[PDB]
Design a protein around this ligand. Structure first.
Ligand SMILES: *[C@@H]1O[C@H](CO)[C@@H](O)[C@H](O)[C@H]1NC(C)=O
Lengths: 69, 113, 30
C-alpha cells in the first residue's frame, strides 16, 4: 500500500482526469435518459498517486452514463 | 530516464544527490515503452556494490494552486487600506492601494485576474 | 444504448476569479 486517505430523483456527475502523476476529480449535482441542459462542475481533490489508469469499473450495491474527454 | 524515473520538461524544483559508499539495487531495463513523467511501475537488474552508489532526493513545488502552507520564515504585519503601499500576499509582491471589495469569491478561489 | 451529451460536462478550469468576460481556454473537455 502506497496511498491512503479517509475523509468525513437527482443527477450526480463527475469528471476524472489523469496527468503528470496527478488524478483530478470534479463534481457537480443537479435535481431533475440524460436530460438536455447546462451545468457546471467544481473541483474537489487531486491525488498524487503515480499509476497508469487504462481501465475502471463502477461499484454497485438504476442507470449510469459514460462519456470521454 | 526511460523505464525508471522521468522528469517533465517543464519541471520546477530541485534535485539533490550525495555520495554514500560508507553504507552503500534493482533497476528495470526491459519494458514495452517509456514512462510518463512522475509515473511508477512496480526484467530487473541488480547493481554491483560500476561506481559507488549515490542517494538522490527530488523536491517538487506546487505553485499556489491551493491555499499556501509551506512558506519561509517571515513576519506578517497589519494591512493598511486607502494608502499606496508595497504589498506581499503569500509571496505575490507588488505596489498599490488596497480597498475593501464587493467581489464574491468561491472557496476554491484565491485571487482575481 | 447510446445517448447524446447536450452541452454537458463543463468545469471550472482553474482557481481564479473572473467576472463579466469571455475567456478562451484549451483543455480536456467533453
Ligand atoms: C499503463 O498500462 C498500459 C497497458 O497495461 C501500458 O500500455 C502503458 O504504457 C502503461 N502506462 C505507462 C505510463 O507506462
Amino acid at each position: 500500500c502506497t496511498f491512503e486517505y479517509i475523509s468525513d430523483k437527482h443527477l450526480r456527475e463527475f469528471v476524472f482526469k489523469n496527468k503528470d502523476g496527478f488524478l483530478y476529480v470534479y463534481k457537480g449535482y443537479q435535481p431533475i435518459d440524460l436530460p438536455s441542459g447546462f451545468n457546471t462542475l467544481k473541483p474537489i481533490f487531486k491525488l498524487p498517486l503515480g499509476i497508469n489508469i487504462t481501465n475502471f469499473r463502477a461499484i454497485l450495491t438504476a442507470a449510469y452514463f459514460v462519456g470521454y474527454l | 530516464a526511460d523505464y525508471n524515473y522521468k522528469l517533465p520538461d517543464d519541471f520546477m524544483g530541485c534535485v539533490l544527490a550525495w555520495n554514500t559508499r560508507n553504507i552503500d539495487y534493482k533497476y528495470r531495463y526491459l519494458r514495452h515503452g517509456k514512462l510518463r513523467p512522475f509515473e511508477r511501475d512496480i526484467p530487473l537488474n541488480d547493481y554491483g556494490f560500476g561506481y559507488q552508489p549515490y542517494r538522490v532526493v527530488v523536491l517538487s513545488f506546487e505553485l499556489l494552486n491551493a491555499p499556501a502552507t509551506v512558506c519561509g520564515p517571515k513576519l506578517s504585519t497589519d494591512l493598511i487600506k486607502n494608502q499606496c503601499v508595497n504589498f506581499n500576499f503569500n509571496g505575490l509582491t507588488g505596489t498599490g492601494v488596497l480597498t475593501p471589495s464587493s467581489k464574491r469569491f468561491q472557496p476554491f478561489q484565491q485571487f482575481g485576474r | 444504448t447510446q445517448h447524446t451529451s447536450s452541452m454537458r460536462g463543463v468545469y471550472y478550469p482553474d482557481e481564479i476569479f473572473r467576472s463579466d468576460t469571455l475567456y478562451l481556454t484549451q483543455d480536456l473537455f467533453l
